[PDB]
Structure formats: structure tokens, C-alpha cells
Amino acid sequence: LKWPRDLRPLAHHDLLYMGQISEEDRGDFNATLRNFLVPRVVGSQKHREVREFIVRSLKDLDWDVEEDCFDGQTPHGIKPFCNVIATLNPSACHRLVLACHYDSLLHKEGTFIGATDSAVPCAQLLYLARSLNGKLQNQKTRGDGLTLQLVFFDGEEAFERWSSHDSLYGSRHLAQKWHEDRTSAERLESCLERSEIANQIDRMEVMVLLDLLGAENPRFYSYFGETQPVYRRLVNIESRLNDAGLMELPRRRRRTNYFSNSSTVGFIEDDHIPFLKRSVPIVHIIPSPFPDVWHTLDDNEQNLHHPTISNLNKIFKAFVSEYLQL
Ligand SMILES: [K+]
Ligand SMILES: [K+]
């Protein structure tokens, strides 16, 4: 079955622009990232400060921001959680959803920054909102029934041994909440003709979940045949940026090959699962293998690879631009 939205290839002009990184672009991203490079354990002050920074940043861009807060039982007792959902145009029927988690693992060995997991993805979502603001605000005026939505999940990490009951606290909560919140096309702005909308989760056109980003040379695969048409746009955008010489490589005459044009045999549990189970199409932008620093105290700022982050930012900016026809 074909994708419900006809995917128009990005014009060369727009590809070149989205593939440019200025000195002030790099600086802005790094300033954003610095806010996240702190321990962010569930219920802590720094975690609250990070949430407040996310909320203020997006409110300042005139997005609608909801703080979805609740208390849930964990192996460490009752804990407070708060998901952040930012929506560019609440009224638009369909959402391109980009997502990550903002909590950091409570590590048995001590202070854990979780730079790739997922401080970098958090910063990337805010950077996209900031850097594309003018174009996004223009797109919102179109009445075309599509918008951008950013979800920063709380409580992705397990408190003890990962299990169905100990992990994904924010995502399980939000997926259930949206599934049980009934609605219809008649109540929404410009739904696609053959849309089956019965609840809020049906409005999530595709969920692009970013996780474990920021290490050198990540390898991505299409984890879901359902979203192959969307995934292939990431492959194409990467190829086009390389052809144009817009990727940062350590030597001349190399290419990035992050987005493999294959599928893989790999089952990864993450915040997409509760949405996947409710028929939300998923693109999971997570590397396989995981970065070597995964869940170690070495998942820190200095182990980030900035040229890779810059390259990913170019791909993501071009992707959002293509999908929303910015
Ligand atoms: K121009
Ligand atoms: K993790």
C-alpha cells in the first residue's frame, strides 16, 4: 500500500539551504545542547529545569505546549513523570511527530549524563523548531491539515531491570491517554479524504523517534516495512547531501552511509512500542549497533562526535522540510 501523503522531492534550492551549516547555526545548536548535558534523573531538580527549558523554548516560538504529568508506581516507589508535547498547529488533523526521551538513566555506578541517550536528540528537536521557525510559521497558515508535533517523553528508562512494567512510563501513559481520547475528522482541520480518525492517536501520521544519537558513524536500517516510503526519503536526502558535498567528512572523497538501504533483524524496545501496538507508523532513528558508550558513565559530552551531529542535523532539517514542503 502506498503512503497516504504524496511525498514531493525537495527542490535543489531547498536541499542546498537545509544542507548549509553556518557558524551561528553551530553555535546555536551547541548553546541548546549545553542545557541538556546535565544529569536528568526522574523527579530531580535538574530534570525539572530541563523540562522548563523545553517548555519555555517552544512557547517562545508560539507553539502549543502541553505538560502531561502523572504519578506512576516503579520498583523505586511512586514517581512523578511529565511528558512534554509541543504542537505547531493544534487544529491540523495530521501530525508529523518527532520524538525522544528527556529523562536520564539512574546509573548504579554514579553520575550519568546520557549525552547520546538522549541529550543530543532533545537538542536536535529544539534546534529543528528554532532553525526552521520562519518556515514552520509560514506552513501553519496553509490550512493543509498537516503540522509538526514534538514529544519529549519522560520515564523511558528502567529504574531496575528493563521489563514491560519497568520502562517506557511516559510513552505507555501518553499512548493510552491519546487512544482513549475520542475524536473524528468532522472535528478537525483538513483530514486526508480516506482517513480513519476515531481518537487522538490516529492523528499521529508517523512517529519518527530519535534515540542514541551523537556518536560517530551510526548505522540505521528500516525497522518497519510499513514506513519504508518515509525511511527511503532519509536515504535519498543523505545521498543528495553527499552528492552536493555538504557532509562533513575527515578526508576528501568520502561519503556518509548512515541510512542503510536495507532492513535488519533487530528488535529494539523504546518509546515507540506503545504507539506501534496502537497502529501508529514508526520510523525508529536509533543506531544498530548501539554506541559503545551505551549505558556507561562514558556517555558524556566529550565522547560526542560533532561532525556527525552536524551531518544528522542537515538530514533532519531537509527531511522535515521535504515532508512539510517548507
Ligand atoms: K535562497
Ligand atoms: K537508555
Coordinates of C-alpha atoms and ligand atoms in Angstrom, one line a residue:
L1 CA 0.0 0.0 0.0
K2 CA 1.3 3.5 -0.9
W3 CA 1.9 6.2 1.7
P4 CA -1.3 8.3 2.4
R5 CA 0.5 11.5 1.6
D6 CA 2.2 12.1 -1.7
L7 CA 5.9 12.8 -1.0
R8 CA 7.2 15.6 -3.2
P9 CA 11.0 15.6 -3.6
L10 CA 12.8 18.6 -2.1
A11 CA 13.8 21.2 -4.7
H12 CA 17.6 21.6 -5.2
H13 CA 17.5 25.1 -3.8
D14 CA 15.9 23.9 -0.6
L15 CA 18.2 20.9 -0.3
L16 CA 21.3 23.2 -0.5
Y17 CA 19.9 25.6 2.0
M18 CA 19.0 22.9 4.5
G19 CA 22.4 21.4 4.0
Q20 CA 24.2 24.6 5.0
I21 CA 25.6 25.0 8.4
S22 CA 26.7 28.5 9.4
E23 CA 28.9 29.4 12.4
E24 CA 25.9 30.8 14.2
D25 CA 23.9 27.6 13.4
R26 CA 26.6 25.5 15.1
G27 CA 26.8 27.9 18.0
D28 CA 23.0 28.0 18.4
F29 CA 22.8 24.2 18.4
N30 CA 25.7 23.9 20.9
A31 CA 24.1 26.5 23.2
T32 CA 20.9 24.5 23.1
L33 CA 22.7 21.2 23.8
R34 CA 24.5 22.6 26.8
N35 CA 21.2 22.9 28.6
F36 CA 20.7 19.1 28.3
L37 CA 24.2 18.0 29.2
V38 CA 23.4 17.6 32.9
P39 CA 22.0 14.6 34.9
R40 CA 18.2 14.4 34.3
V41 CA 17.0 11.7 36.7
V42 CA 13.3 11.3 37.2
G43 CA 11.9 13.7 39.9
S44 CA 15.1 15.7 40.3
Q45 CA 15.6 19.4 40.2
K46 CA 17.8 19.4 37.2
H47 CA 15.2 17.2 35.4
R48 CA 12.5 19.9 36.2
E49 CA 14.8 22.6 35.0
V50 CA 15.3 20.8 31.7
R51 CA 11.6 20.3 31.3
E52 CA 11.0 24.0 32.0
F53 CA 13.7 24.9 29.4
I54 CA 12.0 22.7 26.8
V55 CA 8.6 24.2 27.5
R56 CA 9.8 27.9 27.5
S57 CA 11.8 27.4 24.3
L58 CA 8.8 26.1 22.4
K59 CA 6.3 28.6 24.0
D60 CA 8.6 31.4 22.9
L61 CA 8.2 30.0 19.3
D62 CA 4.4 30.3 19.7
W63 CA 3.9 26.5 19.8
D64 CA 1.1 25.0 21.8
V65 CA 2.8 23.2 24.7
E66 CA 1.1 20.6 27.0
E67 CA 2.8 19.2 30.1
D68 CA 1.3 15.7 30.5
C69 CA 2.1 14.9 34.1
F70 CA 1.1 11.9 36.2
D71 CA 2.4 9.7 39.1
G72 CA 3.3 6.0 38.4
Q73 CA 4.5 3.1 40.5
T74 CA 8.0 1.9 39.9
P75 CA 10.4 -0.5 41.6
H76 CA 11.7 2.6 43.5
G77 CA 8.2 3.5 44.7
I78 CA 5.8 6.2 43.4
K79 CA 7.4 8.6 40.9
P80 CA 6.3 11.8 39.2
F81 CA 6.5 11.9 35.4
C82 CA 5.8 14.6 32.9
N83 CA 5.8 14.2 29.1
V84 CA 6.1 17.4 27.0
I85 CA 4.0 17.7 23.9
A86 CA 4.5 20.7 21.6
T87 CA 2.3 21.2 18.6
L88 CA 2.8 23.8 15.9
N89 CA -0.8 23.9 14.8
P90 CA -3.2 22.1 17.3
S91 CA -6.1 22.2 14.8
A92 CA -4.4 20.4 11.9
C93 CA -5.8 16.9 11.6
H94 CA -2.5 15.1 11.0
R95 CA 0.9 15.4 12.8
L96 CA 4.4 14.5 11.7
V97 CA 5.6 13.5 15.1
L98 CA 9.3 13.8 16.1
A99 CA 10.1 12.3 19.5
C100 CA 12.8 11.5 22.0
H101 CA 13.1 11.0 25.8
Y102 CA 14.4 13.6 28.2
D103 CA 15.0 11.6 31.4
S104 CA 18.4 10.1 32.0
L105 CA 19.2 6.7 33.5
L106 CA 19.7 6.4 37.2
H107 CA 23.0 4.6 36.9
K108 CA 24.3 2.2 39.5
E109 CA 27.9 3.4 39.2
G110 CA 27.2 7.1 39.6
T111 CA 26.6 10.4 37.8
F112 CA 25.3 9.6 34.2
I113 CA 24.9 12.4 31.6
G114 CA 23.3 10.3 28.8
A115 CA 24.8 12.6 26.1
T116 CA 23.6 10.4 23.3
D117 CA 20.8 9.0 25.4
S118 CA 19.1 11.3 24.7
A119 CA 20.5 14.8 25.3
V120 CA 21.6 15.1 21.7
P121 CA 18.2 14.1 20.3
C122 CA 16.5 16.5 22.7
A123 CA 18.7 19.3 21.5
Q124 CA 18.1 18.3 17.9
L125 CA 14.3 18.6 18.2
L126 CA 14.6 22.1 19.7
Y127 CA 17.2 23.1 17.1
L128 CA 14.8 22.0 14.3
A129 CA 12.0 24.1 15.8
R130 CA 14.3 27.1 16.2
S131 CA 16.2 26.9 12.9
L132 CA 13.0 26.2 10.8
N133 CA 10.8 28.6 12.8
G134 CA 10.1 31.1 10.0
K135 CA 9.3 28.3 7.5
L136 CA 7.2 26.4 10.0
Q137 CA 5.1 29.5 10.9
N138 CA 4.5 30.0 7.2
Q139 CA 3.5 26.4 6.7
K140 CA 1.0 26.7 9.6
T141 CA -1.0 29.3 7.6
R142 CA -1.7 26.9 4.7
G143 CA -4.8 25.1 6.1
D144 CA -3.4 21.9 4.6
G145 CA -4.3 19.6 7.6
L146 CA -0.7 18.7 8.4
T147 CA 1.5 20.0 11.2
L148 CA 4.7 19.3 13.2
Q149 CA 4.5 17.8 16.8
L150 CA 7.4 17.3 19.1
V151 CA 7.1 14.8 22.0
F152 CA 9.7 14.7 24.8
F153 CA 8.9 11.5 26.8
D154 CA 9.6 11.2 30.4
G155 CA 10.4 7.9 32.2
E156 CA 11.8 6.0 29.2
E157 CA 14.5 4.4 31.3
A158 CA 14.0 1.4 33.6
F159 CA 14.7 2.0 37.3
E160 CA 16.0 -1.6 37.7
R161 CA 16.0 -4.4 35.2
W162 CA 14.1 -3.4 32.0
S163 CA 10.7 -5.1 31.8
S164 CA 7.2 -4.4 30.5
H165 CA 6.3 -2.8 33.9
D166 CA 9.7 -1.0 34.4
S167 CA 10.4 1.1 31.4
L168 CA 8.5 3.4 29.0
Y169 CA 6.5 5.1 31.7
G170 CA 5.8 8.3 29.8
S171 CA 5.1 6.7 26.5
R172 CA 2.8 3.9 27.8
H173 CA 0.9 6.7 29.6
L174 CA 0.6 9.0 26.7
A175 CA -0.3 6.3 24.2
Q176 CA -3.1 5.1 26.4
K177 CA -4.3 8.7 27.1
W178 CA -4.5 9.5 23.4
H179 CA -6.0 6.2 22.4
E180 CA -8.9 6.7 24.9
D181 CA -9.4 10.4 23.9
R182 CA -12.1 10.1 21.2
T183 CA -12.4 12.4 18.2
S184 CA -13.5 12.4 14.5
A185 CA -12.5 14.1 11.2
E186 CA -15.5 16.4 11.4
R187 CA -13.9 18.0 14.5
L188 CA -10.5 18.5 12.9
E189 CA -8.9 20.7 10.2
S190 CA -8.5 19.2 6.7
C191 CA -8.0 15.5 7.3
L192 CA -7.0 13.4 4.2
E193 CA -10.0 12.0 2.4
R194 CA -9.8 8.4 3.4
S195 CA -8.7 9.0 7.0
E196 CA -10.0 6.7 9.8
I197 CA -9.9 9.0 12.8
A198 CA -11.5 7.7 15.9
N199 CA -9.2 9.0 18.6
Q200 CA -6.1 11.3 19.1
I201 CA -3.6 8.5 18.3
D202 CA -5.0 8.2 14.8
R203 CA -3.8 11.8 14.2
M204 CA -0.2 10.7 14.5
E205 CA 0.6 10.3 10.8
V206 CA 4.1 8.9 11.5
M207 CA 6.2 8.9 14.6
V208 CA 9.9 9.5 14.0
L209 CA 11.7 8.5 17.2
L210 CA 15.3 9.7 17.7
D211 CA 17.5 7.8 20.2
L212 CA 21.2 7.2 21.0
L213 CA 22.4 9.9 18.5
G214 CA 25.7 11.7 18.7
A215 CA 28.4 9.0 18.3
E216 CA 30.5 8.7 15.2
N217 CA 29.3 6.6 12.2
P218 CA 25.8 5.4 13.3
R219 CA 24.2 2.7 11.2
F220 CA 20.4 3.0 10.7
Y221 CA 18.1 0.5 9.0
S222 CA 14.4 0.5 8.1
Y223 CA 13.0 -1.4 11.2
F224 CA 9.4 -1.3 9.8
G225 CA 8.2 -2.2 6.4
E226 CA 5.1 0.0 7.0
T227 CA 7.2 3.2 6.9
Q228 CA 9.6 2.2 4.1
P229 CA 8.4 5.0 1.9
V230 CA 9.2 7.6 4.7
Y231 CA 12.5 5.9 5.6
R232 CA 13.6 5.9 2.0
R233 CA 13.4 9.7 2.0
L234 CA 16.1 9.8 4.7
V235 CA 18.3 7.5 2.5
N236 CA 17.6 9.8 -0.5
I237 CA 18.3 13.0 1.4
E238 CA 21.6 11.7 2.7
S239 CA 22.6 10.6 -0.8
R240 CA 21.8 14.1 -2.2
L241 CA 23.7 15.9 0.6
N242 CA 26.7 13.7 -0.1
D243 CA 26.5 14.3 -3.9
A244 CA 26.4 18.0 -3.3
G245 CA 29.5 17.8 -1.0
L246 CA 27.6 19.1 2.0
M247 CA 28.5 16.4 4.5
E248 CA 31.5 16.8 6.9
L249 CA 34.0 14.0 6.4
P250 CA 37.5 13.8 7.8
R251 CA 39.1 13.4 4.3
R252 CA 38.2 14.3 0.7
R253 CA 36.3 11.8 -1.4
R254 CA 34.3 10.0 1.3
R255 CA 30.5 9.7 1.8
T256 CA 28.4 9.2 4.9
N257 CA 26.4 5.9 4.9
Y258 CA 24.2 6.3 8.0
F259 CA 20.9 5.3 6.5
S260 CA 21.4 1.8 5.0
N261 CA 19.1 0.9 2.2
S262 CA 18.2 -2.3 3.8
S263 CA 16.1 -3.7 6.6
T264 CA 17.5 -5.6 9.6
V265 CA 16.7 -8.3 12.0
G266 CA 16.7 -6.3 15.2
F267 CA 14.1 -6.0 18.0
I268 CA 14.6 -2.8 20.0
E269 CA 12.3 -1.7 22.8
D270 CA 11.8 2.0 23.1
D271 CA 9.1 4.7 23.4
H272 CA 7.6 3.8 20.0
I273 CA 6.3 0.4 21.3
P274 CA 3.1 1.6 22.9
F275 CA 2.3 3.6 19.8
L276 CA 3.3 0.8 17.4
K277 CA 0.8 -1.5 19.3
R278 CA -1.9 1.0 18.5
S279 CA -1.1 1.1 14.8
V280 CA 1.0 4.3 14.7
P281 CA 3.5 4.1 11.8
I282 CA 7.1 4.3 13.2
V283 CA 10.4 5.3 11.9
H284 CA 13.0 4.5 14.6
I285 CA 16.1 6.5 14.1
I286 CA 18.4 4.6 16.5
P287 CA 21.7 3.0 15.6
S288 CA 22.4 -0.7 15.4
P289 CA 24.8 -1.5 17.0
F290 CA 24.2 0.9 19.9
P291 CA 27.1 3.3 20.6
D292 CA 29.9 1.7 22.5
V293 CA 29.3 4.2 25.4
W294 CA 25.6 3.0 25.8
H295 CA 24.6 3.0 29.5
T296 CA 28.2 3.6 30.7
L297 CA 29.4 6.7 32.5
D298 CA 31.4 7.4 29.3
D299 CA 28.2 8.5 27.6
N300 CA 29.2 12.1 28.1
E301 CA 29.9 15.4 26.2
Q302 CA 33.4 14.7 25.2
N303 CA 32.5 11.4 23.5
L304 CA 30.1 13.1 21.2
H305 CA 31.2 13.5 17.6
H306 CA 30.3 16.9 16.4
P307 CA 30.7 16.5 12.6
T308 CA 28.3 13.5 12.8
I309 CA 25.8 15.6 14.8
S310 CA 26.1 18.4 12.1
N311 CA 25.5 15.8 9.3
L312 CA 22.4 14.4 11.1
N313 CA 21.1 17.9 11.7
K314 CA 21.3 18.5 7.9
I315 CA 19.5 15.3 7.1
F316 CA 16.8 16.0 9.7
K317 CA 16.2 19.6 8.6
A318 CA 16.0 18.5 5.0
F319 CA 13.6 15.7 6.0
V320 CA 11.2 18.0 7.9
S321 CA 11.4 20.5 5.0
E322 CA 10.6 17.8 2.5
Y323 CA 7.7 16.2 4.5
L324 CA 6.0 19.5 5.3
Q325 CA 7.0 21.1 2.0
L326 CA 8.6 24.0 3.8
Ligands
K1 K 17.8 31.4 -1.3
K2 K 19.0 4.4 27.8

